[PDB]
Amino acid sequence: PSIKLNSGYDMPAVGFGCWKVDVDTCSEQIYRAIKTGYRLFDGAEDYANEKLVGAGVKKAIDEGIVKREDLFLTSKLWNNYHHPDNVEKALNRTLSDLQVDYVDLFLIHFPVTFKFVPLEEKYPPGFYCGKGDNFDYEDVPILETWKALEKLVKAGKIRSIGVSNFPGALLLDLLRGATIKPSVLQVEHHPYLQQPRLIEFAQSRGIAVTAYSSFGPQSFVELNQGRALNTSPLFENETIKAIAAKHGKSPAQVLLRWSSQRGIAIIPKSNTVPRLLENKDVNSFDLDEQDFADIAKLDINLRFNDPWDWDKIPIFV
Numbered sequence: 001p002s003i004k005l006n007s008g009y010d011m012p013a014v015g016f017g018c019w020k021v022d023v024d025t026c027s028e029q030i031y032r033a034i035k036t037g038y039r040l041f042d043g044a045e046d047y048a049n050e051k052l053v054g055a056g057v058k059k060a061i062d063e064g065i066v067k068r069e070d071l072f073l074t075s076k077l078w079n080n081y082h083h084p085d086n087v088e089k090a091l092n093r094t095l096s097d098l099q100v101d102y103v104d105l106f107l108i109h110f111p112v113t114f115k116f117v118p119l120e121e122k123y124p125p126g127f128y129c130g131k132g133d134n135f136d137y138e139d140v141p142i143l144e145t146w147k148a149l150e151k152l153v154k155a156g157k158i159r160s161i162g163v164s165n166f167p168g169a170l171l172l173d174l175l176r177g178a179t180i181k182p183s184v185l186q187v188e189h190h191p192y193l194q195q196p197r198l199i200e201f202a203q204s205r206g207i208a209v210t211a212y213s214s215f216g217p218q219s220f221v222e223l224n225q226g227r228a229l230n231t232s233p234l235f236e237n238e239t240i241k242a243i244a245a246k247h248g249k250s251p252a253q254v255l256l257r258w259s260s261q262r263g264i265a266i267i268p269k270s271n272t273v274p275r276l277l278e279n280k281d282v283n284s285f286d287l288d289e290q291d292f293a294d295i296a297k298l299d300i301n302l303r304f305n306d307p308w309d310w311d312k313i314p315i316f317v
Protein backbone atom coordinates (compact mmCIF):
# COMPACT_ATOMS: atom_id res chain seq x y z
CA PRO A 1 0.00 0.00 0.00
CA SER A 2 1.25 3.33 -1.32
CA ILE A 3 0.64 7.15 -1.21
CA LYS A 4 0.93 9.04 -4.42
CA LEU A 5 2.96 12.18 -3.69
CA ASN A 6 2.47 15.40 -5.54
CA SER A 7 5.92 14.98 -7.01
CA GLY A 8 4.64 11.94 -8.94
CA TYR A 9 6.40 9.23 -6.89
CA ASP A 10 4.72 6.69 -4.67
CA MET A 11 5.66 6.50 -1.02
CA PRO A 12 5.14 3.26 0.87
CA ALA A 13 2.46 3.91 3.50
CA VAL A 14 4.19 1.86 6.25
CA GLY A 15 7.88 2.24 6.90
CA PHE A 16 10.62 1.50 9.35
CA GLY A 17 11.78 4.24 11.78
CA CYS A 18 15.52 4.62 12.21
CA TRP A 19 15.70 6.86 15.32
CA LYS A 20 17.65 5.23 18.20
CA VAL A 21 17.88 1.80 16.57
CA ASP A 22 20.35 -0.25 18.69
CA VAL A 23 23.70 0.76 17.11
CA ASP A 24 25.32 -2.76 17.33
CA THR A 25 22.50 -4.40 15.33
CA CYS A 26 21.48 -1.47 13.13
CA SER A 27 22.80 -2.81 9.79
CA GLU A 28 21.43 -6.35 10.52
CA GLN A 29 18.04 -4.84 11.45
CA ILE A 30 17.76 -2.86 8.26
CA TYR A 31 18.64 -5.99 6.18
CA ARG A 32 16.16 -8.01 8.15
CA ALA A 33 13.36 -5.48 7.75
CA ILE A 34 14.00 -5.34 3.96
CA LYS A 35 13.82 -9.16 3.81
CA THR A 36 10.55 -8.98 5.90
CA GLY A 37 9.01 -6.63 3.23
CA TYR A 38 9.61 -3.03 4.47
CA ARG A 39 10.39 -0.69 1.62
CA LEU A 40 10.58 2.79 3.30
CA PHE A 41 13.25 3.69 5.81
CA ASP A 42 12.85 6.94 7.68
CA GLY A 43 16.32 8.24 8.50
CA ALA A 44 18.08 11.46 9.41
CA GLU A 45 21.59 13.01 9.57
CA ASP A 46 20.90 13.56 13.23
CA TYR A 47 20.19 9.83 14.00
CA ALA A 48 23.92 9.12 13.59
CA ASN A 49 23.40 5.80 11.80
CA GLU A 50 23.16 6.63 8.12
CA LYS A 51 26.35 4.58 7.45
CA LEU A 52 24.80 1.63 9.32
CA VAL A 53 21.56 1.95 7.38
CA GLY A 54 23.51 2.16 4.12
CA ALA A 55 25.34 -1.18 4.85
CA GLY A 56 22.01 -2.96 5.60
CA VAL A 57 20.69 -1.73 2.24
CA LYS A 58 24.04 -2.61 0.48
CA LYS A 59 23.74 -6.22 1.63
CA ALA A 60 20.08 -6.61 0.62
CA ILE A 61 20.77 -5.15 -2.83
CA ASP A 62 23.92 -7.34 -3.42
CA GLU A 63 21.98 -10.53 -2.34
CA GLY A 64 19.19 -9.78 -4.85
CA ILE A 65 16.33 -9.35 -2.27
CA VAL A 66 15.57 -5.87 -3.51
CA LYS A 67 16.49 -3.35 -6.22
CA ARG A 68 17.43 0.34 -5.48
CA GLU A 69 14.26 1.50 -7.28
CA ASP A 70 12.05 -0.60 -4.94
CA LEU A 71 13.31 1.13 -1.80
CA PHE A 72 12.17 4.53 -0.54
CA LEU A 73 14.94 6.16 1.40
CA THR A 74 14.10 9.25 3.49
CA SER A 75 16.57 11.51 5.18
CA LYS A 76 16.41 14.92 6.86
CA LEU A 77 18.60 18.02 6.71
CA TRP A 78 19.85 18.83 10.21
CA ASN A 79 19.51 22.33 11.77
CA ASN A 80 23.19 23.41 11.23
CA TYR A 81 22.84 23.02 7.57
CA HIS A 82 20.16 25.47 6.24
CA HIS A 83 22.47 27.95 4.56
CA PRO A 84 22.34 27.41 0.81
CA ASP A 85 26.17 26.94 0.60
CA ASN A 86 25.87 24.08 3.18
CA VAL A 87 22.71 22.23 2.08
CA GLU A 88 24.58 20.25 -0.54
CA LYS A 89 27.46 19.39 1.88
CA ALA A 90 25.04 17.73 4.22
CA LEU A 91 23.10 15.96 1.44
CA ASN A 92 26.42 14.71 -0.10
CA ARG A 93 27.39 13.22 3.24
CA THR A 94 23.98 11.48 3.50
CA LEU A 95 24.31 10.10 -0.08
CA SER A 96 27.83 8.79 0.68
CA ASP A 97 26.87 7.20 4.06
CA LEU A 98 23.81 5.56 2.48
CA GLN A 99 25.91 4.63 -0.57
CA VAL A 100 23.27 5.87 -3.04
CA ASP A 101 23.08 8.39 -5.89
CA TYR A 102 19.76 10.01 -4.84
CA VAL A 103 17.48 9.94 -1.82
CA ASP A 104 13.78 9.49 -2.36
CA LEU A 105 12.62 12.13 0.18
CA PHE A 106 14.67 14.86 1.78
CA LEU A 107 13.00 16.73 4.64
CA ILE A 108 13.89 19.94 6.47
CA HIS A 109 14.12 18.35 9.92
CA PHE A 110 13.14 21.40 11.91
CA PRO A 111 12.37 25.12 11.10
CA VAL A 112 15.37 25.94 13.35
CA THR A 113 18.65 27.45 12.09
CA PHE A 114 21.75 26.45 14.12
CA LYS A 115 25.07 28.11 13.29
CA PHE A 116 26.92 26.04 10.66
CA VAL A 117 29.63 23.68 11.99
CA PRO A 118 31.99 22.13 9.47
CA LEU A 119 31.43 18.39 8.94
CA GLU A 120 35.14 17.52 9.62
CA GLU A 121 34.85 19.34 12.92
CA LYS A 122 31.86 17.53 14.37
CA TYR A 123 29.46 15.18 12.62
CA PRO A 124 26.68 14.76 13.32
CA PRO A 125 26.56 17.99 15.44
CA GLY A 126 23.47 17.53 17.58
CA PHE A 127 23.00 20.67 19.63
CA TYR A 128 26.56 21.89 19.06
CA CYS A 129 26.58 25.25 17.33
CA GLY A 130 30.26 26.07 17.29
CA LYS A 131 30.17 27.98 20.57
CA GLY A 132 30.87 25.72 23.52
CA ASP A 133 27.79 24.22 25.16
CA ASN A 134 25.82 27.29 23.92
CA PHE A 135 23.15 27.45 21.26
CA ASP A 136 23.96 29.82 18.44
CA TYR A 137 21.76 30.58 15.44
CA GLU A 138 22.10 31.95 11.93
CA ASP A 139 19.73 34.14 9.84
CA VAL A 140 18.72 31.89 6.93
CA PRO A 141 15.01 32.13 6.09
CA ILE A 142 13.27 28.82 5.31
CA LEU A 143 12.64 29.83 1.71
CA GLU A 144 16.45 30.18 1.09
CA THR A 145 16.89 26.58 2.32
CA TRP A 146 13.97 25.47 0.19
CA LYS A 147 15.39 27.02 -3.00
CA ALA A 148 18.68 25.20 -2.38
CA LEU A 149 16.63 21.98 -2.04
CA GLU A 150 14.88 22.72 -5.29
CA LYS A 151 18.27 22.96 -7.14
CA LEU A 152 19.16 19.54 -5.61
CA VAL A 153 15.97 18.03 -7.06
CA LYS A 154 16.78 19.55 -10.46
CA ALA A 155 20.28 17.97 -10.22
CA GLY A 156 18.76 14.52 -9.59
CA LYS A 157 20.11 14.03 -6.11
CA ILE A 158 16.67 14.07 -4.43
CA ARG A 159 13.36 12.97 -5.86
CA SER A 160 10.87 14.63 -3.47
CA ILE A 161 11.26 17.31 -0.84
CA GLY A 162 9.30 18.04 2.30
CA VAL A 163 9.34 19.40 5.74
CA SER A 164 9.20 18.07 9.28
CA ASN A 165 7.90 19.84 12.43
CA PHE A 166 6.31 22.83 10.65
CA PRO A 167 3.24 24.45 12.10
CA GLY A 168 0.40 25.47 9.88
CA ALA A 169 1.21 29.18 9.38
CA LEU A 170 4.82 28.33 8.47
CA LEU A 171 3.81 25.71 5.93
CA LEU A 172 1.29 28.09 4.42
CA ASP A 173 4.02 30.74 4.00
CA LEU A 174 6.40 28.22 2.49
CA LEU A 175 3.69 27.33 -0.11
CA ARG A 176 3.63 30.93 -1.22
CA GLY A 177 7.37 30.89 -2.11
CA ALA A 178 7.83 27.28 -3.30
CA THR A 179 8.24 26.36 -7.03
CA ILE A 180 8.30 22.63 -6.20
CA LYS A 181 5.68 22.22 -3.58
CA PRO A 182 6.39 20.30 -0.39
CA SER A 183 5.47 16.64 -0.90
CA VAL A 184 5.31 15.63 2.71
CA LEU A 185 4.69 17.05 6.18
CA GLN A 186 6.14 14.85 8.91
CA VAL A 187 4.82 15.64 12.38
CA GLU A 188 4.37 14.21 15.86
CA HIS A 189 0.93 12.51 15.77
CA HIS A 190 -0.71 10.21 18.36
CA PRO A 191 -3.93 10.34 20.27
CA TYR A 192 -2.66 12.64 22.93
CA LEU A 193 -1.58 15.30 20.20
CA GLN A 194 -4.09 15.02 17.38
CA GLN A 195 -3.78 18.43 15.67
CA PRO A 196 -6.84 17.73 13.49
CA ARG A 197 -6.85 21.06 11.77
CA LEU A 198 -3.20 20.80 10.82
CA ILE A 199 -3.78 17.39 9.19
CA GLU A 200 -6.92 18.67 7.47
CA PHE A 201 -4.94 21.61 6.03
CA ALA A 202 -2.08 19.56 4.71
CA GLN A 203 -4.20 16.84 3.14
CA SER A 204 -6.48 19.42 1.46
CA ARG A 205 -3.36 20.77 -0.25
CA GLY A 206 -2.28 17.31 -1.50
CA ILE A 207 0.63 17.02 0.99
CA ALA A 208 0.95 13.56 2.44
CA VAL A 209 1.23 13.53 6.20
CA THR A 210 3.77 11.19 7.93
CA ALA A 211 3.06 10.59 11.58
CA TYR A 212 5.85 10.08 14.03
CA SER A 213 5.79 8.81 17.59
CA SER A 214 2.52 6.93 16.88
CA PHE A 215 2.97 5.27 20.28
CA GLY A 216 3.21 8.67 22.00
CA PRO A 217 5.42 8.84 25.12
CA GLN A 218 6.90 5.36 24.59
CA SER A 219 9.78 6.47 22.32
CA PHE A 220 10.78 9.14 24.89
CA VAL A 221 10.75 6.78 27.92
CA GLU A 222 14.05 5.31 26.47
CA LEU A 223 15.68 8.80 26.91
CA ASN A 224 14.39 9.30 30.47
CA GLN A 225 12.33 12.33 29.48
CA GLY A 226 10.39 13.57 32.53
CA ARG A 227 7.18 14.30 30.57
CA ALA A 228 7.15 10.86 28.87
CA LEU A 229 7.72 9.05 32.21
CA ASN A 230 4.69 10.66 33.99
CA THR A 231 2.42 9.98 30.96
CA SER A 232 0.05 6.95 31.06
CA PRO A 233 1.06 4.67 28.12
CA LEU A 234 -1.35 4.69 25.18
CA PHE A 235 -1.12 0.86 25.24
CA GLU A 236 -2.80 0.83 28.69
CA ASN A 237 -5.42 3.44 27.90
CA GLU A 238 -9.00 2.26 28.63
CA THR A 239 -10.32 3.49 25.32
CA ILE A 240 -7.53 1.98 23.30
CA LYS A 241 -8.10 -1.32 25.10
CA ALA A 242 -11.88 -1.32 24.53
CA ILE A 243 -11.24 -0.76 20.87
CA ALA A 244 -8.54 -3.41 20.64
CA ALA A 245 -10.91 -5.96 22.38
CA LYS A 246 -13.82 -5.01 20.11
CA HIS A 247 -11.80 -5.82 16.94
CA GLY A 248 -9.61 -8.58 18.39
CA LYS A 249 -6.45 -6.53 17.67
CA SER A 250 -3.60 -5.35 19.81
CA PRO A 251 -3.44 -1.81 21.24
CA ALA A 252 -0.53 -1.17 18.93
CA GLN A 253 -2.53 -2.19 15.90
CA VAL A 254 -5.30 0.22 16.97
CA LEU A 255 -2.80 3.11 17.45
CA LEU A 256 -1.28 2.60 14.01
CA ARG A 257 -4.56 1.95 12.22
CA TRP A 258 -5.96 5.21 13.63
CA SER A 259 -3.46 6.95 11.32
CA SER A 260 -3.12 4.59 8.36
CA GLN A 261 -6.88 4.50 7.86
CA ARG A 262 -6.92 8.29 7.58
CA GLY A 263 -4.35 8.14 4.81
CA ILE A 264 -1.51 9.23 7.14
CA ALA A 265 1.86 7.36 6.51
CA ILE A 266 3.40 5.60 9.45
CA ILE A 267 6.99 4.77 10.40
CA PRO A 268 6.90 2.81 13.66
CA LYS A 269 10.21 1.81 15.29
CA SER A 270 10.09 -1.97 15.29
CA ASN A 271 12.83 -3.51 17.49
CA THR A 272 11.84 -7.27 17.48
CA VAL A 273 10.76 -9.68 14.64
CA PRO A 274 7.17 -10.01 15.89
CA ARG A 275 6.87 -6.22 16.08
CA LEU A 276 8.25 -6.02 12.56
CA LEU A 277 5.38 -8.32 11.43
CA GLU A 278 2.65 -6.79 13.61
CA ASN A 279 3.43 -3.15 12.59
CA LYS A 280 3.60 -4.00 8.89
CA ASP A 281 -0.05 -4.82 8.64
CA VAL A 282 -2.50 -3.05 10.78
CA ASN A 283 -4.48 -2.60 7.50
CA SER A 284 -6.10 -5.96 8.24
CA PHE A 285 -9.27 -4.29 9.70
CA ASP A 286 -11.36 -1.14 9.88
CA LEU A 287 -12.03 1.16 12.81
CA ASP A 288 -15.54 2.56 12.63
CA GLU A 289 -16.91 6.02 13.25
CA GLN A 290 -17.58 5.36 16.94
CA ASP A 291 -13.98 4.25 17.34
CA PHE A 292 -12.58 7.54 15.87
CA ALA A 293 -14.98 9.48 17.99
CA ASP A 294 -13.83 7.79 21.20
CA ILE A 295 -10.13 8.15 20.33
CA ALA A 296 -10.76 11.88 19.48
CA LYS A 297 -11.61 12.45 23.16
CA LEU A 298 -8.08 11.54 24.26
CA ASP A 299 -6.55 14.72 22.66
CA ILE A 300 -4.86 16.77 25.45
CA ASN A 301 -2.25 18.63 23.28
CA LEU A 302 0.60 16.81 24.86
CA ARG A 303 3.73 17.28 22.83
CA PHE A 304 6.89 15.18 23.43
CA ASN A 305 9.16 16.56 20.78
CA ASP A 306 9.34 20.32 21.52
CA PRO A 307 12.32 22.71 20.75
CA TRP A 308 10.96 24.90 23.58
CA ASP A 309 12.67 22.23 25.82
CA TRP A 310 16.03 22.71 24.08
CA ASP A 311 16.38 26.52 24.32
CA LYS A 312 12.89 28.19 24.40
CA ILE A 313 12.75 28.08 20.58
CA PRO A 314 9.13 29.24 19.75
CA ILE A 315 8.26 26.71 16.97
CA PHE A 316 5.05 25.47 18.62
CA VAL A 317 3.75 28.63 20.50
Ligand SMILES: NC(=O)c1ccc[n+]([C@@H]2O[C@H](COP(=O)([O-])OP(=O)(O)OC[C@H]3O[C@@H](n4cnc5c(N)ncnc54)[C@H](OP(=O)(O)O)[C@@H]3O)[C@@H](O)[C@H]2O)c1
Binds near residue numbers: 305
Ligand atom coordinates in the same frame (compact mmCIF):
# COMPACT_ATOMS: atom_id res chain seq x y z
N1 LIG B 1 11.42 15.14 14.26
C1 LIG B 1 11.16 14.15 13.47
O1 LIG B 1 10.85 14.32 12.25
C2 LIG B 1 11.06 12.82 14.16
C3 LIG B 1 11.04 12.77 15.67
C4 LIG B 1 10.81 11.43 16.17
C5 LIG B 1 10.70 10.34 15.31
N2 LIG B 1 10.78 10.43 13.96
C6 LIG B 1 10.68 9.22 13.08
O2 LIG B 1 9.51 8.44 13.39
C7 LIG B 1 9.98 7.12 13.79
C8 LIG B 1 9.06 6.50 14.79
O3 LIG B 1 8.81 7.24 15.96
P1 LIG B 1 9.55 6.85 17.35
O4 LIG B 1 10.85 6.20 17.00
O5 LIG B 1 9.42 8.00 18.21
O6 LIG B 1 8.73 5.75 18.14
P2 LIG B 1 7.30 4.97 18.00
O7 LIG B 1 7.32 4.29 16.66
O8 LIG B 1 6.14 5.74 18.61
O9 LIG B 1 7.63 4.11 19.31
C9 LIG B 1 8.69 3.18 19.25
C10 LIG B 1 8.57 2.31 20.48
O10 LIG B 1 7.32 1.58 20.58
C11 LIG B 1 7.52 0.25 21.08
N3 LIG B 1 6.87 -0.63 20.11
C12 LIG B 1 7.11 -0.64 18.78
N4 LIG B 1 6.29 -1.51 18.10
C13 LIG B 1 5.52 -2.03 19.08
C14 LIG B 1 4.45 -3.00 19.11
N5 LIG B 1 4.07 -3.56 17.95
N6 LIG B 1 3.90 -3.29 20.28
C15 LIG B 1 4.29 -2.74 21.44
N7 LIG B 1 5.26 -1.83 21.52
C16 LIG B 1 5.88 -1.44 20.38
C17 LIG B 1 9.04 0.13 21.21
O11 LIG B 1 9.26 0.35 22.61
P3 LIG B 1 10.12 -0.64 23.55
O12 LIG B 1 11.13 -1.22 22.54
O13 LIG B 1 10.57 0.44 24.52
O14 LIG B 1 9.19 -1.71 24.12
C18 LIG B 1 9.69 1.29 20.49
O15 LIG B 1 10.76 1.88 21.23
C19 LIG B 1 11.40 7.30 14.27
O16 LIG B 1 12.08 6.07 14.44
C20 LIG B 1 11.90 8.29 13.25
O17 LIG B 1 12.29 7.67 12.01
C21 LIG B 1 10.93 11.65 13.39
